[model samples]
Each structure stands twice: as C-alpha cells, then as structure tokens.
Target: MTDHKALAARFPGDFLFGVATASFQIEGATKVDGRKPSIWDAFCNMPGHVFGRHNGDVACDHYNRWEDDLDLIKEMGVEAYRFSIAWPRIIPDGFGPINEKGLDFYDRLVDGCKARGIKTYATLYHWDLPLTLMGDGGWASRSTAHAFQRYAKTVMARLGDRLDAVATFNSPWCAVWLSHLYGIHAPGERNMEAALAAMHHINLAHGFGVEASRHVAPKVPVGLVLNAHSVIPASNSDADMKAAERAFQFHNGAFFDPVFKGEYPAEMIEALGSRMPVVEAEDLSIISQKLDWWGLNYYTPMRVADDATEGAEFPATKQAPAVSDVKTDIGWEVYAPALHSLVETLYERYELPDCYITENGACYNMGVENGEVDDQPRLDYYAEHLGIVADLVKDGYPMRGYFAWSLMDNFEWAEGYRMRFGLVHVDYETQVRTLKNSGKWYSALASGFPK
Candidate 1:
C-alpha cells in the first residue's frame, strides 16, 4: 500500500495513527443545545467575508450526527480520532455557566470512540472563540487569558481520563497572524499592533491552559500545536535568503521562541521596536511551561523574495511562485523536502520531548462519482509527507504520531467548503459522506498497509 512500508515496522503498536477535525469546521449545531455564537459565526454573518458568503450553520452536521461518525471511524479504522471542543458550545456566554448539553455531546463522542477501541486526542480550542470573548479585546486581553483557565479546568475535569493526549490550541499563527495581522480569518483586523498583542496574550492563555490541565488531569499529556510555513528563498541571492529568514522570524520565531527559549527573537524585537507586546517579566516564565510534547503541523512551503520598496511591510518580503509546479488546488507548493527541513529545524532548535506531525494533508477539490471519490493528487501528497516521516523515524527523529489535516470536508474558514482537505468527501447538501480513494488507502494503512 505504501513504498514507505518502513513506517509499519518502525514502532510498536502504541504509535498513534489517526484523522483530525476541528469543531467549527465540522460540528454544526452552532445555535443548538444552548450554544451561543463564536467569532467565526459572527464573521460568517458579515457579508462577503467567507467564500460565497457560505457559513458553518449546518456543517457536516457532526454535532447531531457524531455517533454515526464514530461508527464510521471504527469502520474506516484508526487508533485515534483527533477532534476539538468548541468554547462557545461549552461556555456560550464566555465566562458564564457551563452548558451540560454541550458537554453531553462530547461526553458521548469520547465514550463512543472508547467503546469502538479508538483512542481520543482532544483539543480545547481551535480558533472558535465565544463571540462575547471579543467584548474584552479577545485574545489581546489578560482577562481573557484567565477566563481560558476556567474553561480549560472545566473541560479537563469532565473529559480528561478518556483522552490519550490534549492540546491547548491549534495554529497560533493562524489565530494571530492570519486573523489579526492579515485579516484573512475570523475576528479579522489587519493591524500589526493588534496582531502582536493577540500573539502574546494567546501564548499567555496557553500557559494558563497548561496549568489548568496539570491541576485537573495531572496524568494526561498536554501540549500546544504550531503550524510551520517553510518560507524558502526564491533565488540563491543573499537578499532573497535574508528575506526568507526574516519571514521565519515572524512566522515561526514569534511563537516558537517564547515557548521554547523564554524570549522573543532579538531580530524581531529590534524590528518591532515599541510595537511589541507588553511582555511582563513574569510572562515568559508562564509562557515557557514545561510541555510534554510538541505538535508540528506542516502542509506546503512558500517561496519568498526581498521587497525593495521603501514603504514595505516589516519583513519586507514578497511572495514568489511556489517551489514546485506540482501544487495543491489551494495553490500550495508540493515540496516534500520542506518537511525534512522542518523536522531538522525544529529538532535542532528546540528540545522537544517528543514530536508529532499534527496536521499534514492536501486540498484537492474532487467530488463523489459512481459511489467513490478519487483524489489521486491528495494520495500522492500523503504518500510523500508520510514517507518523509517514515524516513525520519529511521533517521532517529522519531515522529511519535501523525494525524491528517482533516477527517472530512466541512466549513474551511475563509475559503469555505470549496477548499476541501478531507480524505472523506462529504455532501454538504444531503449530509452524505463518501470516503475518498485516499481515505480507503489511509484506512488500509491503518489496518496494516495492504500489499
């Protein structure tokens, strides 16, 4: 089933192999079960924000249809099913009372997985902040960080024992850079100051979450997920190389340094000047909690060149074409070497206790036909990325686990449903799900890669 069959023999049976999905991206019932609106829900309401003005009001219907989904997971087969819990559903009013109905849904989902011999990896937040959370400056406020402490404790107390591993948040870059700096996602605001503020506060909130998880579920594993964009140089010139390095300073260093090294990149600190977040002396100590593991999510690499314009952005970088012509439908380069580079960079720079390839997949917009969906491009993408990890394990890097970017296509934030990253093809209209060829291939790999 795979040229990279070494992955099958490299580790013991405990190695986690699974699919992942986010709450807002899959679970609908946005307004059901005493659930209030999230920042995403509000962002969807504003005209022209999401693609075709599409929303997650009735996405994949996972909130109401999860039992069947768990059964589907069992049928397709995987050891773990990684999913996120929506903050709004649990505490709809942002610091208000807990909603048992919301808890009941996840309670059943977790137990259902266990009943089916499946492991559970739960994430507390995946960018779906309660709408009211924005009232106090969203992730930019210290008060919000403390508020997350309460919610984290509540969820950890209820669903901690059953979880194989739990994470504080996913893709801090998307939460801060995409949403606050680039304004490409929900709670959109294209302000550097706001982006910097949210960046620090988000890390601070993660510290609180780690502390809460320790208190509530001391035995359970806890970590945070960071997505890496390998911004490679477009040319061999020193100018392009410098711009690429500068891009990493913002893309990775901003979050990675504070978490692993307890400080910001000196280059960025000087570049940002007074615009930097008000990081108290104690904040770094809190931000640099002793993590159990590190979650690294990678998709594709972007090529960067130096921007010579005087009034350009902080990084002074301009996007060059992708590193390869074999790109995904979403226009990302299909550069497998980037994954190798990422593994080496993270391993050499940070002392990660263990590492997991949290989210890696392809976005090929293919629909069901003749009771099957054929996404060969995505299959190749998985083959390349998974094979890289397999080779790394043999090379002694030991990526402990690998969870695909998504389980099924639902509401992809700004791009909406058209940007399908799922191995399973879902019909949004009839709520029908048909596993793609790539999904079958993955399932085969799970059961013991079919030769």
Candidate 2:
C-alpha cells in the first residue's frame, strides 16, 4: 500500500487535484426535460454494439442526485471538478432550437459547484453527439464543423459567465478515427474516406469551437483534451523501432502536429497515400489556432511490434510482450513512468502550453465489504501516478493539475458498469454512494496531507 502521509509531501502547493466524469456516463435521464437522443443513445439500442447490451438510461441517477453528488465531491476538498456537458441535452435536435430545461439543469450544476468554491472545467463535447446530426453525414462532413461552432457559441453564452475553462473536444481521435476507421464506437463506419474526412472536420471544429467560446466570453480560457498514449518498441530490432514510430505517428502525431505545428505529419501523409483528407490553405490556419492550454488524458503505455510485409502502406499494431503481472481490471498494464515520459516528450517536441492531467486513474472491482469498500489497488495507482506528476512539475514541464479518471462509478463506455474506476462505490440499483479507502486517501491529499 502507498503511504499517504509520505506521498503528500511530493505534491506542490500550486498543483491542483480533482476528479472527472462525463455527461452520458454519469447523468442519465435520457428521455427527460426535453432532451433528445445522442448518438450513444441510438448506438446502445443497436444489438451487439455494447457488451451485456448495457446502456446509460439511469446511470448513477446523477440527473436527479446532482446536488448530493456535489456535496460528496466537496467532502473530498478538491479545488476543481472536471465534467462534460451533453450536446443533446442542450440542443435536442443538433441544429434547430435550444432547450431551456436542459440549459437550466447545467446552470444549477455550475451554481452548486460555485457554492462549494470548486473550480469548474467544462468540456463542450465528450463523444455524445446528438443523433440528429448523424443522419447528416456526422463528423464526416464539414457541415458538422460549422454545427459544432454554433453549439459551442450556444453553450458558452449560457455557462461562460461562471465556467473557469472549456475544452472544445475531449478526444477527437476516438470521435473521428476509432468510430469511423475501426467501427468500434457510436455512428460506427469502416470506410477510410469517412475516417479521413472526419479527422479533418474534427480539427476544423476544434479550431472553430475555440473561436466560438472566445467570442462569447473573451476572458474565458479554451483548450482541447487528447487521450495520448506512450508507444514503446517490443525489442531493439530496427523493425520494432519502426513499428513504434508508425504507431506514434498514426495516433499522437496525427492530432498533435496539426494543432500545434499547423502541419500534418509527413509519415502519415506518405502512409495514407490516396486516403489523405483534402486540406485547403485556410483549413490548416483554422486547425492551428493558438490555445490557452492543453489537457491530456493518459491511461497506459502501448508496446507495439512490427507487423509489416514488404511495400505495405502501414504496419499492423500488436501488444508488446508483458513485463509485469500488475494490470488494471480493464486489462491495462500499470506503467506510471509513461506519464512522465509522455509529458516530457511533448515538452521537447513543441512549445507546450499550460497542460493539465485531465484524467488519470485505475479500475479495480472490489465491491462493498462490511459496508466499506477497500480499494487499495486504486489508492496505490493514484499515489504512483501523482508522484510522477509532482516530480515532473518540479522539473518545469508545464504540468499544473491532475484529475482522477472518475469521482464515482457510473456507466463505463462499452464495458458498462462492470469496470469501476471510481473512488466512491455506487450501487446502481439503489443509487447509494459508499466512500472507498481510495476516497479517504484522496480526501487527505486534497485537504493538504500532513507534513
């Protein structure tokens, strides 16, 4: 077990610690208060789309129990709370009119956070695109970019007055590449053309979205959140090294380069060949707009082995051989040092803006035992990860904050509620919240651990 008192000394006074959750993952009430369906809602209805055929119909009942949830968060003594706003909740039918009832819901949520003196970092889109937009070519069409700009304007106009900062898109790679190219997420499509188009449009939307938020509230800081993973080679062989480079280019460089450097990676263009998306001169300018900050959500390091034949366009990705038995309940290997390497690599490659560890936590399914959940695994995960963050900040790597993956267990994406990453244990059926040992450990950290 990690020593909480000793770990507390590593944290700097200027560092911010908090928890994060998504709208669709936490706030149920899918069919209430004039809120229409999001793509995830429709995706859940489809057979075989999600494991156990699970959906987020009434996840944690946060829609009704938000005040209590905020109270629970305040108990942790966190300085900030990072949560997302559901686009469908604010605008039922992607394009037409605003929903006052939906707007009022978030107004109350922000007010509650303010009442507790907790800073709010609101994400504009967290992969819950309105279903109505799907029929109109979704992110594949440039129209969706314009639609997103309008959506950002509407949201900032309503909540900008109180919101501390806003992230235009949580993870554009998942929204565009994974959903379109791999067909693993909502609005799934397995077309290369669609994936390329979606990637370009997402970048366009990100740039435009930042502009929209700034237009509504000139003083409000805006940024983008990316789920960047570390790519390591399986061996010292040249083939494995090349494979790692390809994986990094496809995943990290594809998105990072366009936003920070105003240019796509040459490796990607050569590999994609005819599949490359059309980029107008103005498109790059829009995609490269300066941002107030950046947010990174890291989980695990990927060990890539080369799977390429002669003259292949791209190499296939496979997991590197295991080095340790320590793994998360979700099957991810625990590698805290990867977080330090990722931050350091970013600092070396580009002039990084103020960056925050938006999401970092592990899943461990240790349910209630004698009315108290003992989650020592998760406690150790936070301690190890935060220790790296503290060290990196001292090295002057622009790392300013850290927010745990979730505040409580809710509807985990395709895995549903089976994988728990929350500090507080939740009874899905009874809507009961039980503080786990990790919660106590974090509460101590947030309250300024004993010196």
Candidates' lDDT values, in order? Answer: 0.86, 0.86
Task: Give the least accurate 10-residue stretch of model 1, judged by summed lDDT.
Answer: 1-10
lDDT of 1 by residue, 152-215 (tens): 9999899998887899999999999999988899799999888889988888999889999999
Cα RMSD for candidate 1?
1.9
Candidate 2 per-residue C-alpha lDDT over 198-281 given as tens digits, one digit per residue, 9 for 90 to 100: 888998899999889888988888889999878888998988998888888788887898899998888788768477566777
Error of 1 at 76 (Å): 1.8
Which pairs of residues collide in candidate 1? none
Count backbone overlaps in model 1.
0
User: What stretches of model 2 exceed 4 Å from their correct place?
Assistant: 310-315, 449-451
- Could you tell me how far off, in angstroms, the CA of residue 336 lies in candidate 2 after the best superposition? 1.0
Alpha-carbon shift of residue 134 in model 2 (angstroms): 1.0
Tell me the lDDT of candidate 1.
0.86
